[PDB]
Amino acid sequence: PGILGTWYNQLGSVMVVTRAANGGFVGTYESAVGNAEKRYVMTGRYDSAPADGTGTAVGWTVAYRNAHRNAHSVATWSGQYVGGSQERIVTQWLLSYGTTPADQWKSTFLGHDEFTRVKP
Amino acid sequence: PGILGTWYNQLGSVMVVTRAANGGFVGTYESAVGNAEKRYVMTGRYDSAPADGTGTAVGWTVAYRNAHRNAHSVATWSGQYVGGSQERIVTQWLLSYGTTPADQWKSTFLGHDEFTRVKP
Amino acid sequence: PGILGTWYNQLGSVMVVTRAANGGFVGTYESAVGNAEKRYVMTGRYDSAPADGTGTAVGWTVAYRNAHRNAHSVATWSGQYVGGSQERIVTQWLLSYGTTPADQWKSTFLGHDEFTRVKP
Amino acid sequence: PGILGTWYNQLGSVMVVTRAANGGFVGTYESAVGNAEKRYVMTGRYDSAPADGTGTAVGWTVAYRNAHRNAHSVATWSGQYVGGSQERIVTQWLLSYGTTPADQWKSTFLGHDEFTRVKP
Ligand SMILES: O=C(O)CCCC[C@@H]1SC[C@@H]2NC(=O)N[C@@H]21
Ligand SMILES: O=C(O)CCCC[C@@H]1SC[C@@H]2NC(=O)N[C@@H]21
Ligand SMILES: O=C(O)CCCC[C@@H]1SC[C@@H]2NC(=O)N[C@@H]21
Ligand SMILES: O=C(O)CCCC[C@@H]1SC[C@@H]2NC(=O)N[C@@H]21
Protein backbone atom coordinates (compact mmCIF):
# COMPACT_ATOMS: atom_id res chain seq x y z
CA PRO A 1 0.00 0.00 0.00
CA GLY A 2 2.82 2.41 0.86
CA ILE A 3 1.17 4.42 3.65
CA LEU A 4 3.17 3.01 6.58
CA GLY A 5 4.76 5.52 8.92
CA THR A 6 4.48 9.23 9.65
CA TRP A 7 2.50 11.80 7.65
CA TYR A 8 1.99 15.55 8.06
CA ASN A 9 -0.88 17.67 6.78
CA GLN A 10 -0.85 21.40 6.03
CA LEU A 11 -1.75 22.20 9.68
CA GLY A 12 1.24 20.41 11.19
CA SER A 13 -0.90 17.50 12.37
CA VAL A 14 0.85 14.14 12.70
CA MET A 15 -0.64 10.89 11.40
CA VAL A 16 1.31 7.72 12.26
CA VAL A 17 0.25 4.54 10.45
CA THR A 18 1.66 1.76 12.63
CA ARG A 19 0.23 -1.25 10.76
CA ALA A 20 -1.40 -1.76 7.36
CA ALA A 21 -2.47 -5.06 5.79
CA ASN A 22 -5.33 -6.73 3.91
CA GLY A 23 -7.17 -3.48 3.19
CA GLY A 24 -7.16 -2.20 6.77
CA PHE A 25 -4.75 -0.08 8.76
CA VAL A 26 -4.33 1.35 12.25
CA GLY A 27 -2.29 4.00 14.02
CA THR A 28 -2.39 7.31 15.86
CA TYR A 29 -3.48 10.84 15.00
CA GLU A 30 -2.21 14.01 16.67
CA SER A 31 -4.01 17.22 15.71
CA ALA A 32 -2.07 20.49 15.80
CA VAL A 33 -5.30 22.53 16.15
CA GLY A 34 -8.62 22.34 17.96
CA ASN A 35 -9.50 20.77 21.29
CA ALA A 36 -6.84 18.06 21.23
CA GLU A 37 -3.60 17.04 22.92
CA LYS A 38 -1.27 14.02 22.71
CA ARG A 39 -2.34 11.13 20.46
CA TYR A 40 -5.66 9.52 19.54
CA VAL A 41 -6.44 6.06 18.20
CA MET A 42 -6.90 5.84 14.43
CA THR A 43 -8.48 3.07 12.36
CA GLY A 44 -9.20 3.00 8.66
CA ARG A 45 -9.44 1.15 5.37
CA TYR A 46 -7.88 1.33 1.92
CA ASP A 47 -8.30 -0.19 -1.54
CA SER A 48 -5.89 -3.14 -1.52
CA ALA A 49 -6.10 -3.49 -5.34
CA PRO A 50 -6.15 -0.02 -6.91
CA ALA A 51 -6.82 0.26 -10.63
CA ASP A 52 -3.77 0.89 -12.78
CA GLY A 53 -2.96 4.57 -13.23
CA THR A 54 -5.24 5.74 -10.40
CA GLY A 55 -4.78 6.64 -6.76
CA THR A 56 -5.49 4.35 -3.82
CA ALA A 57 -8.80 5.21 -2.14
CA VAL A 58 -8.37 5.56 1.62
CA GLY A 59 -10.44 6.56 4.63
CA TRP A 60 -9.99 6.60 8.39
CA THR A 61 -11.78 7.54 11.61
CA VAL A 62 -10.46 9.30 14.72
CA ALA A 63 -12.51 9.67 17.90
CA TYR A 64 -11.02 12.67 19.69
CA ARG A 65 -11.06 11.16 23.18
CA ASN A 66 -7.83 9.88 24.68
CA ALA A 67 -7.01 9.35 28.35
CA HIS A 68 -6.07 13.06 28.58
CA ARG A 69 -9.00 14.84 26.94
CA ASN A 70 -12.38 14.43 25.25
CA ALA A 71 -13.67 16.95 22.70
CA HIS A 72 -16.79 14.74 22.26
CA SER A 73 -16.13 14.77 18.49
CA VAL A 74 -15.36 12.12 15.84
CA ALA A 75 -13.54 12.94 12.63
CA THR A 76 -13.37 10.93 9.41
CA TRP A 77 -11.11 11.49 6.39
CA SER A 78 -11.94 10.27 2.89
CA GLY A 79 -9.76 10.57 -0.19
CA GLN A 80 -6.93 8.79 -1.99
CA TYR A 81 -3.23 8.00 -1.66
CA VAL A 82 -1.26 9.22 -4.71
CA GLY A 83 2.09 7.55 -5.33
CA GLY A 84 5.14 8.81 -7.18
CA SER A 85 7.03 11.75 -5.70
CA GLN A 86 5.53 13.93 -4.51
CA GLU A 87 3.59 11.25 -2.67
CA ARG A 88 0.53 12.63 -0.93
CA ILE A 89 -2.79 11.73 0.66
CA VAL A 90 -5.50 14.17 -0.45
CA THR A 91 -8.62 14.08 1.72
CA GLN A 92 -11.84 15.78 2.69
CA TRP A 93 -12.95 15.34 6.28
CA LEU A 94 -16.05 15.56 8.48
CA LEU A 95 -15.83 16.55 12.15
CA SER A 96 -19.05 15.71 14.01
CA TYR A 97 -19.83 16.59 17.63
CA GLY A 98 -22.37 14.91 19.87
CA THR A 99 -25.22 17.37 20.31
CA THR A 100 -28.73 17.85 21.59
CA PRO A 101 -31.58 17.29 19.10
CA ALA A 102 -32.00 21.08 18.87
CA ASP A 103 -28.35 21.53 17.81
CA GLN A 104 -27.96 18.71 15.26
CA TRP A 105 -28.07 21.23 12.40
CA LYS A 106 -24.68 22.66 13.50
CA SER A 107 -23.03 19.39 14.51
CA THR A 108 -20.64 18.79 11.59
CA PHE A 109 -17.66 20.73 10.25
CA LEU A 110 -16.25 20.11 6.77
CA GLY A 111 -12.70 20.64 5.56
CA HIS A 112 -9.92 19.17 3.45
CA ASP A 113 -6.46 17.92 4.46
CA GLU A 114 -3.42 17.22 2.29
CA PHE A 115 -0.85 14.90 3.89
CA THR A 116 2.82 14.67 2.91
CA ARG A 117 5.88 12.78 4.12
CA VAL A 118 7.76 15.97 5.03
CA LYS A 119 6.30 18.35 7.60
CA PRO A 120 5.43 21.68 5.89
CA PRO B 1 -22.35 2.52 23.88
CA GLY B 2 -25.50 0.78 22.64
CA ILE B 3 -24.63 0.35 18.94
CA LEU B 4 -24.07 -3.42 18.97
CA GLY B 5 -25.91 -5.43 16.34
CA THR B 6 -27.80 -4.75 13.12
CA TRP B 7 -28.77 -1.35 11.72
CA TYR B 8 -30.64 -0.28 8.58
CA ASN B 9 -30.46 3.04 6.76
CA GLN B 10 -33.10 4.60 4.51
CA LEU B 11 -31.68 2.74 1.47
CA GLY B 12 -32.07 -0.74 2.94
CA SER B 13 -28.34 -1.04 3.59
CA VAL B 14 -27.31 -3.31 6.46
CA MET B 15 -24.69 -2.33 9.05
CA VAL B 16 -23.72 -5.06 11.54
CA VAL B 17 -21.64 -3.96 14.53
CA THR B 18 -20.07 -7.20 15.76
CA ARG B 19 -17.86 -5.77 18.54
CA ALA B 20 -17.63 -2.42 20.33
CA ALA B 21 -15.38 -1.52 23.26
CA ASN B 22 -13.03 1.19 24.55
CA GLY B 23 -14.07 3.76 21.96
CA GLY B 24 -13.61 1.52 18.92
CA PHE B 25 -15.89 -0.86 17.09
CA VAL B 26 -15.83 -3.26 14.14
CA GLY B 27 -18.27 -5.09 11.91
CA THR B 28 -19.62 -5.45 8.39
CA TYR B 29 -21.42 -3.17 5.95
CA GLU B 30 -23.70 -4.30 3.12
CA SER B 31 -24.82 -1.58 0.72
CA ALA B 32 -28.18 -1.97 -1.01
CA VAL B 33 -27.13 0.38 -3.85
CA GLY B 34 -24.08 1.11 -5.97
CA ASN B 35 -21.28 -1.18 -7.10
CA ALA B 36 -21.43 -3.57 -4.16
CA GLU B 37 -22.41 -7.12 -3.25
CA LYS B 38 -22.18 -9.28 -0.10
CA ARG B 39 -20.42 -7.77 2.93
CA TYR B 40 -17.45 -5.45 3.46
CA VAL B 41 -15.21 -4.94 6.47
CA MET B 42 -16.11 -1.98 8.69
CA THR B 43 -14.02 -0.25 11.34
CA GLY B 44 -14.81 2.88 13.31
CA ARG B 45 -14.65 4.90 16.50
CA TYR B 46 -17.08 6.47 18.96
CA ASP B 47 -17.06 8.82 21.94
CA SER B 48 -16.86 6.47 24.94
CA ALA B 49 -17.86 9.28 27.37
CA PRO B 50 -20.58 11.40 25.75
CA ALA B 51 -21.62 14.59 27.50
CA ASP B 52 -24.89 14.41 29.40
CA GLY B 53 -27.93 15.24 27.29
CA THR B 54 -26.08 14.95 23.96
CA GLY B 55 -25.67 12.27 21.33
CA THR B 56 -22.68 9.95 21.00
CA ALA B 57 -20.35 11.06 18.21
CA VAL B 58 -19.51 8.15 15.90
CA GLY B 59 -17.64 7.56 12.66
CA TRP B 60 -16.63 4.56 10.58
CA THR B 61 -14.84 3.62 7.36
CA VAL B 62 -15.74 1.02 4.73
CA ALA B 63 -13.43 0.10 1.86
CA TYR B 64 -15.70 -1.31 -0.84
CA ARG B 65 -13.47 -4.22 -1.81
CA ASN B 66 -14.35 -7.70 -0.61
CA ALA B 67 -13.26 -11.02 -2.09
CA HIS B 68 -16.17 -10.76 -4.58
CA ARG B 69 -15.86 -7.23 -5.96
CA ASN B 70 -13.89 -3.99 -5.87
CA ALA B 71 -15.50 -0.63 -6.66
CA HIS B 72 -12.11 1.05 -5.91
CA SER B 73 -13.94 3.37 -3.48
CA VAL B 74 -13.74 4.07 0.27
CA ALA B 75 -16.67 5.48 2.22
CA THR B 76 -16.67 7.16 5.63
CA TRP B 77 -19.66 8.07 7.81
CA SER B 78 -19.57 10.79 10.46
CA GLY B 79 -22.37 11.73 12.83
CA GLN B 80 -23.84 10.76 16.20
CA TYR B 81 -25.77 7.97 17.90
CA VAL B 82 -28.98 9.27 19.51
CA GLY B 83 -30.45 7.15 22.29
CA GLY B 84 -34.02 6.91 23.55
CA SER B 85 -36.65 5.46 21.23
CA GLN B 86 -36.56 6.15 18.42
CA GLU B 87 -32.87 5.29 18.58
CA ARG B 88 -31.01 6.35 15.46
CA ILE B 89 -27.59 7.04 13.99
CA VAL B 90 -27.66 10.23 11.90
CA THR B 91 -24.68 10.60 9.57
CA GLN B 92 -23.19 12.40 6.61
CA TRP B 93 -20.86 10.38 4.42
CA LEU B 94 -18.09 10.80 1.86
CA LEU B 95 -17.54 8.27 -0.94
CA SER B 96 -14.13 8.72 -2.58
CA TYR B 97 -12.85 6.83 -5.63
CA GLY B 98 -9.24 6.34 -6.63
CA THR B 99 -8.67 8.51 -9.70
CA THR B 100 -6.10 9.93 -12.05
CA PRO B 101 -4.68 13.38 -11.21
CA ALA B 102 -6.86 14.85 -13.97
CA ASP B 103 -10.04 13.44 -12.37
CA GLN B 104 -9.44 14.27 -8.68
CA TRP B 105 -11.98 17.10 -8.87
CA LYS B 106 -14.82 14.57 -9.34
CA SER B 107 -13.53 11.88 -6.97
CA THR B 108 -15.85 12.33 -3.96
CA PHE B 109 -19.60 11.96 -3.51
CA LEU B 110 -21.43 13.42 -0.51
CA GLY B 111 -24.63 12.20 1.09
CA HIS B 112 -26.38 11.57 4.39
CA ASP B 113 -27.61 8.31 5.95
CA GLU B 114 -30.04 7.77 8.82
CA PHE B 115 -29.76 4.35 10.49
CA THR B 116 -32.50 2.68 12.54
CA ARG B 117 -32.98 -0.65 14.29
CA VAL B 118 -35.96 -1.62 12.12
CA LYS B 119 -35.54 -1.90 8.36
CA PRO B 120 -37.65 0.82 6.65
CA PRO C 1 -40.04 25.52 -12.75
CA GLY C 2 -42.63 25.30 -9.97
CA ILE C 3 -40.61 26.71 -7.05
CA LEU C 4 -42.41 30.06 -6.74
CA GLY C 5 -43.64 31.01 -3.29
CA THR C 6 -43.08 29.89 0.29
CA TRP C 7 -41.16 26.80 1.43
CA TYR C 8 -40.40 25.36 4.87
CA ASN C 9 -37.55 23.07 5.87
CA GLN C 10 -37.44 20.65 8.80
CA LEU C 11 -36.17 23.43 11.12
CA GLY C 12 -39.09 25.77 10.53
CA SER C 13 -37.02 28.06 8.33
CA VAL C 14 -38.92 30.04 5.69
CA MET C 15 -37.74 30.36 2.08
CA VAL C 16 -39.77 32.72 -0.12
CA VAL C 17 -39.06 32.57 -3.86
CA THR C 18 -40.41 35.89 -5.15
CA ARG C 19 -39.34 35.58 -8.81
CA ALA C 20 -38.06 32.75 -11.00
CA ALA C 21 -37.33 32.86 -14.73
CA ASN C 22 -34.75 31.84 -17.35
CA GLY C 23 -32.81 29.58 -14.99
CA GLY C 24 -32.42 32.11 -12.19
CA PHE C 25 -34.51 32.99 -9.18
CA VAL C 26 -34.52 35.41 -6.25
CA GLY C 27 -36.23 35.82 -2.90
CA THR C 28 -35.78 35.88 0.86
CA TYR C 29 -34.58 33.39 3.46
CA GLU C 30 -35.51 33.42 7.15
CA SER C 31 -33.63 30.96 9.35
CA ALA C 32 -35.37 29.61 12.45
CA VAL C 33 -32.01 28.77 14.10
CA GLY C 34 -28.56 30.26 14.48
CA ASN C 35 -27.46 33.89 14.57
CA ALA C 36 -30.26 35.26 12.41
CA GLU C 37 -33.38 37.41 12.60
CA LYS C 38 -35.89 38.79 10.07
CA ARG C 39 -35.19 38.12 6.37
CA TYR C 40 -32.07 37.88 4.21
CA VAL C 41 -31.60 38.30 0.48
CA MET C 42 -31.52 35.06 -1.52
CA THR C 43 -30.29 34.46 -5.07
CA GLY C 44 -29.92 31.20 -6.93
CA ARG C 45 -30.09 29.17 -10.11
CA TYR C 46 -31.95 26.13 -11.42
CA ASP C 47 -31.94 23.79 -14.41
CA SER C 48 -34.50 25.33 -16.77
CA ALA C 49 -34.66 22.13 -18.89
CA PRO C 50 -34.57 19.11 -16.57
CA ALA C 51 -34.24 15.67 -18.13
CA ASP C 52 -37.43 13.65 -18.29
CA GLY C 53 -38.07 11.56 -15.20
CA THR C 54 -35.47 13.37 -13.06
CA GLY C 55 -35.55 16.17 -10.52
CA THR C 56 -34.69 19.80 -11.22
CA ALA C 57 -31.20 20.68 -9.99
CA VAL C 58 -31.26 23.85 -7.89
CA GLY C 59 -28.86 25.91 -5.80
CA TRP C 60 -28.96 29.22 -3.96
CA THR C 61 -26.83 31.50 -1.80
CA VAL C 62 -27.75 33.48 1.33
CA ALA C 63 -25.40 35.99 2.95
CA TYR C 64 -26.55 36.23 6.56
CA ARG C 65 -26.27 40.00 6.85
CA ASN C 66 -29.41 42.11 6.73
CA ALA C 67 -29.91 45.63 8.06
CA HIS C 68 -30.62 44.13 11.52
CA ARG C 69 -27.76 41.68 12.05
CA ASN C 70 -24.58 40.20 10.58
CA ALA C 71 -23.40 36.70 11.48
CA HIS C 72 -20.45 37.18 9.04
CA SER C 73 -21.46 33.89 7.37
CA VAL C 74 -22.62 32.86 3.87
CA ALA C 75 -24.69 29.75 3.26
CA THR C 76 -25.26 27.88 0.00
CA TRP C 77 -27.76 25.09 -0.70
CA SER C 78 -27.33 22.54 -3.49
CA GLY C 79 -29.77 19.81 -4.46
CA GLN C 80 -32.85 19.22 -6.60
CA TYR C 81 -36.54 20.09 -6.80
CA VAL C 82 -38.71 16.95 -6.96
CA GLY C 83 -42.19 17.38 -8.42
CA GLY C 84 -45.33 15.33 -7.88
CA SER C 85 -46.91 15.34 -4.43
CA GLN C 86 -45.19 15.27 -2.10
CA GLU C 87 -43.23 18.05 -3.78
CA ARG C 88 -39.95 18.75 -2.03
CA ILE C 89 -36.55 20.40 -2.39
CA VAL C 90 -33.82 18.11 -1.01
CA THR C 91 -30.53 19.89 -0.37
CA GLN C 92 -27.14 19.76 1.28
CA TRP C 93 -25.72 23.06 2.47
CA LEU C 94 -22.43 24.72 3.39
CA LEU C 95 -22.25 27.50 6.00
CA SER C 96 -18.92 29.35 5.84
CA TYR C 97 -17.76 32.07 8.22
CA GLY C 98 -15.13 34.69 7.55
CA THR C 99 -12.11 33.75 9.66
CA THR C 100 -8.47 34.45 10.35
CA PRO C 101 -5.90 32.37 8.43
CA ALA C 102 -5.30 30.36 11.62
CA ASP C 103 -9.00 29.41 11.86
CA GLN C 104 -9.78 28.53 8.22
CA TRP C 105 -9.80 24.82 9.10
CA LYS C 106 -12.98 25.29 11.18
CA SER C 107 -14.72 27.82 8.93
CA THR C 108 -17.40 25.67 7.26
CA PHE C 109 -20.37 23.74 8.62
CA LEU C 110 -22.14 21.06 6.58
CA GLY C 111 -25.75 19.94 6.81
CA HIS C 112 -28.79 18.93 4.80
CA ASP C 113 -32.20 20.60 4.49
CA GLU C 114 -35.47 19.19 3.14
CA PHE C 115 -38.00 21.84 2.08
CA THR C 116 -41.75 21.30 1.77
CA ARG C 117 -44.79 23.42 0.96
CA VAL C 118 -46.40 22.82 4.36
CA LYS C 119 -44.57 23.88 7.52
CA PRO C 120 -43.68 20.74 9.56
CA PRO D 1 -15.46 44.08 -1.47
CA GLY D 2 -12.54 43.64 -3.87
CA ILE D 3 -13.78 40.64 -5.89
CA LEU D 4 -14.54 42.47 -9.14
CA GLY D 5 -13.06 41.01 -12.30
CA THR D 6 -11.45 37.75 -13.39
CA TRP D 7 -10.42 34.86 -11.14
CA TYR D 8 -8.80 31.49 -11.85
CA ASN D 9 -8.96 28.33 -9.76
CA GLN D 10 -6.46 25.46 -9.69
CA LEU D 11 -8.25 23.75 -12.61
CA GLY D 12 -7.93 26.67 -15.01
CA SER D 13 -11.59 27.59 -14.63
CA VAL D 14 -12.48 31.25 -15.19
CA MET D 15 -14.78 33.21 -12.88
CA VAL D 16 -15.67 36.74 -14.02
CA VAL D 17 -17.40 38.96 -11.46
CA THR D 18 -19.02 41.67 -13.59
CA ARG D 19 -20.88 43.56 -10.83
CA ALA D 20 -20.76 43.55 -7.03
CA ALA D 21 -22.67 45.83 -4.66
CA ASN D 22 -24.74 45.82 -1.45
CA GLY D 23 -23.80 42.26 -0.50
CA GLY D 24 -24.67 40.68 -3.85
CA PHE D 25 -22.71 40.06 -7.01
CA VAL D 26 -23.17 38.61 -10.49
CA GLY D 27 -21.05 37.38 -13.37
CA THR D 28 -20.05 34.38 -15.45
CA TYR D 29 -18.37 31.06 -14.75
CA GLU D 30 -16.43 28.98 -17.28
CA SER D 31 -15.39 25.51 -16.12
CA ALA D 32 -12.23 23.99 -17.58
CA VAL D 33 -13.41 20.44 -16.75
CA GLY D 34 -16.60 18.40 -16.81
CA ASN D 35 -19.61 18.65 -19.09
CA ALA D 36 -19.32 22.36 -19.83
CA GLU D 37 -18.46 24.78 -22.62
CA LYS D 38 -18.51 28.58 -23.02
CA ARG D 39 -19.90 30.63 -20.11
CA TYR D 40 -22.67 30.16 -17.55
CA VAL D 41 -24.59 32.70 -15.49
CA MET D 42 -23.33 33.20 -11.94
CA THR D 43 -25.06 34.83 -8.98
CA GLY D 44 -23.92 35.04 -5.39
CA ARG D 45 -23.67 36.89 -2.10
CA TYR D 46 -20.94 38.18 0.20
CA ASP D 47 -20.54 39.69 3.66
CA SER D 48 -20.60 43.45 3.02
CA ALA D 49 -19.23 44.20 6.52
CA PRO D 50 -16.55 41.62 7.39
CA ALA D 51 -15.17 41.59 10.91
CA ASP D 52 -11.76 43.17 11.33
CA GLY D 53 -8.89 40.75 10.80
CA THR D 54 -11.05 38.06 9.16
CA GLY D 55 -11.86 37.04 5.61
CA THR D 56 -14.98 38.01 3.70
CA ALA D 57 -17.50 35.17 3.58
CA VAL D 58 -18.71 34.55 0.03
CA GLY D 59 -20.91 32.09 -1.83
CA TRP D 60 -22.27 31.74 -5.35
CA THR D 61 -24.40 29.45 -7.51
CA VAL D 62 -23.90 28.32 -11.12
CA ALA D 63 -26.51 26.35 -13.05
CA TYR D 64 -24.58 24.52 -15.76
CA ARG D 65 -27.05 25.18 -18.57
CA ASN D 66 -26.27 27.83 -21.15
CA ALA D 67 -27.66 28.16 -24.66
CA HIS D 68 -25.00 25.68 -25.86
CA ARG D 69 -25.23 22.82 -23.37
CA ASN D 70 -27.00 21.47 -20.29
CA ALA D 71 -25.29 19.10 -17.86
CA HIS D 72 -28.49 19.15 -15.72
CA SER D 73 -26.32 20.08 -12.71
CA VAL D 74 -26.13 23.07 -10.33
CA ALA D 75 -22.96 23.95 -8.45
CA THR D 76 -22.55 26.16 -5.38
CA TRP D 77 -19.32 27.47 -3.84
CA SER D 78 -19.01 28.52 -0.20
CA GLY D 79 -15.95 30.01 1.48
CA GLN D 80 -14.24 33.34 2.05
CA TYR D 81 -12.31 36.05 0.22
CA VAL D 82 -8.90 36.67 1.82
CA GLY D 83 -7.29 40.04 1.11
CA GLY D 84 -3.65 41.06 1.16
CA SER D 85 -1.33 39.56 -1.44
CA GLN D 86 -1.64 36.77 -2.15
CA GLU D 87 -5.34 37.52 -2.48
CA ARG D 88 -7.42 34.38 -2.83
CA ILE D 89 -10.92 32.95 -2.60
CA VAL D 90 -10.86 29.60 -0.78
CA THR D 91 -14.02 27.54 -1.26
CA GLN D 92 -15.68 24.18 -0.92
CA TRP D 93 -18.31 23.33 -3.51
CA LEU D 94 -21.29 21.04 -4.08
CA LEU D 95 -22.23 19.80 -7.55
CA SER D 96 -25.75 18.34 -7.61
CA TYR D 97 -27.41 16.62 -10.57
CA GLY D 98 -31.12 16.17 -11.14
CA THR D 99 -31.85 12.49 -10.61
CA THR D 100 -34.55 9.88 -10.22
CA PRO D 101 -35.68 9.07 -6.66
CA ALA D 102 -33.69 5.83 -6.86
CA ASP D 103 -30.46 7.72 -7.65
CA GLN D 104 -30.67 10.61 -5.14
CA TRP D 105 -28.00 8.97 -2.97
CA LYS D 106 -25.36 9.59 -5.69
CA SER D 107 -26.57 13.02 -6.82
CA THR D 108 -23.97 15.32 -5.24
CA PHE D 109 -20.21 15.68 -5.70
CA LEU D 110 -18.04 17.53 -3.19
CA GLY D 111 -14.77 19.34 -3.81
CA HIS D 112 -12.76 22.44 -2.98
CA ASP D 113 -11.58 25.28 -5.23
CA GLU D 114 -8.92 27.93 -4.59
CA PHE D 115 -9.23 31.02 -6.80
CA THR D 116 -6.42 33.46 -7.56
CA ARG D 117 -5.96 36.55 -9.72
CA VAL D 118 -3.25 34.93 -11.86
CA LYS D 119 -4.04 31.79 -13.82
CA PRO D 120 -1.95 28.88 -12.44
O1 LIG E 1 -11.63 20.27 18.29
C1 LIG E 1 -11.96 19.06 18.28
O2 LIG E 1 -13.17 18.76 18.32
C2 LIG E 1 -10.90 17.98 18.23
C3 LIG E 1 -9.79 18.38 17.26
C4 LIG E 1 -10.29 18.39 15.82
C5 LIG E 1 -9.14 18.61 14.83
C6 LIG E 1 -9.67 18.61 13.40
S1 LIG E 1 -10.09 17.07 12.93
C7 LIG E 1 -10.01 17.56 11.19
C8 LIG E 1 -9.02 18.69 11.02
N1 LIG E 1 -7.76 18.17 10.54
C9 LIG E 1 -6.85 18.17 11.51
O3 LIG E 1 -5.56 17.61 11.38
N2 LIG E 1 -7.33 18.75 12.60
C10 LIG E 1 -8.69 19.21 12.40
O1 LIG F 1 -20.58 2.20 -5.74
C1 LIG F 1 -19.59 2.07 -4.98
O2 LIG F 1 -18.56 2.73 -5.22
C2 LIG F 1 -19.66 1.15 -3.78
C3 LIG F 1 -21.02 1.26 -3.11
C4 LIG F 1 -21.20 2.62 -2.45
C5 LIG F 1 -22.48 2.68 -1.62
C6 LIG F 1 -22.63 4.05 -0.96
S1 LIG F 1 -21.54 4.23 0.29
C7 LIG F 1 -22.52 5.58 0.98
C8 LIG F 1 -23.98 5.39 0.62
N1 LIG F 1 -24.69 4.79 1.72
C9 LIG F 1 -24.97 3.52 1.49
O3 LIG F 1 -25.55 2.65 2.42
N2 LIG F 1 -24.61 3.19 0.25
C10 LIG F 1 -24.04 4.32 -0.45
O1 LIG G 1 -25.65 31.36 12.53
C1 LIG G 1 -25.39 31.91 11.43
O2 LIG G 1 -24.20 32.02 11.08
C2 LIG G 1 -26.50 32.43 10.55
C3 LIG G 1 -27.68 31.46 10.56
C4 LIG G 1 -27.32 30.16 9.85
C5 LIG G 1 -28.53 29.25 9.69
C6 LIG G 1 -28.14 27.96 8.97
S1 LIG G 1 -27.86 28.25 7.35
C7 LIG G 1 -28.07 26.49 6.98
C8 LIG G 1 -29.00 25.86 7.98
N1 LIG G 1 -30.33 25.76 7.42
C9 LIG G 1 -31.15 26.66 7.96
O3 LIG G 1 -32.47 26.88 7.53
N2 LIG G 1 -30.53 27.32 8.93
C10 LIG G 1 -29.18 26.85 9.12
O1 LIG H 1 -20.00 18.29 -15.42
C1 LIG H 1 -20.91 19.07 -15.08
O2 LIG H 1 -21.93 18.60 -14.52
C2 LIG H 1 -20.79 20.55 -15.34
C3 LIG H 1 -19.36 21.02 -15.06
C4 LIG H 1 -19.04 20.94 -13.57
C5 LIG H 1 -17.69 21.58 -13.25
C6 LIG H 1 -17.41 21.49 -11.75
S1 LIG H 1 -18.37 22.57 -10.91
C7 LIG H 1 -17.25 22.49 -9.49
C8 LIG H 1 -15.84 22.18 -9.96
N1 LIG H 1 -15.07 23.39 -10.03
C9 LIG H 1 -14.88 23.77 -11.29
O3 LIG H 1 -14.26 24.97 -11.67
N2 LIG H 1 -15.37 22.86 -12.13
C10 LIG H 1 -15.94 21.74 -11.41
Author numbering:
A (entry chain A), B (entry chain A), C (entry chain A), D (entry chain A): 48 to 167
Please give the exact wording used by the authors of the publication that reports this structure:
In the present study, two avidin-like biotin-binding proteins (named streptavidin C1 and C2) from Streptomyces cinnamonensis were newly identified while exploring antifungal proteins against Fusarium oxysporum f. sp. cucumerinum. Streptavidin C1 reveals a low correlation (a sequence identity of approximately 64%) with all known streptavidins, whereas streptavidin C2 shares a sequence identity of approximately 94% with other streptavidins. Here, the crystal structures of streptavidin C1 in the mature form and in complex with biotin at 2.1 and 2.5 Å resolution, respectively, were assessed.
Firstly, a hydrogen-bonding network with biotin is formed by Asn56, Ser60, Tyr76, Ser78 and Asp160. Tyr111 in Loop5–6 is a specific novel residue that interacts with d-biotin, and in most proteins of the (strept)avidin family this position is occupied by a tryptophan residue, except for tamavidin, which has a phenylalanine at this position. S3(c) and S3(d)].
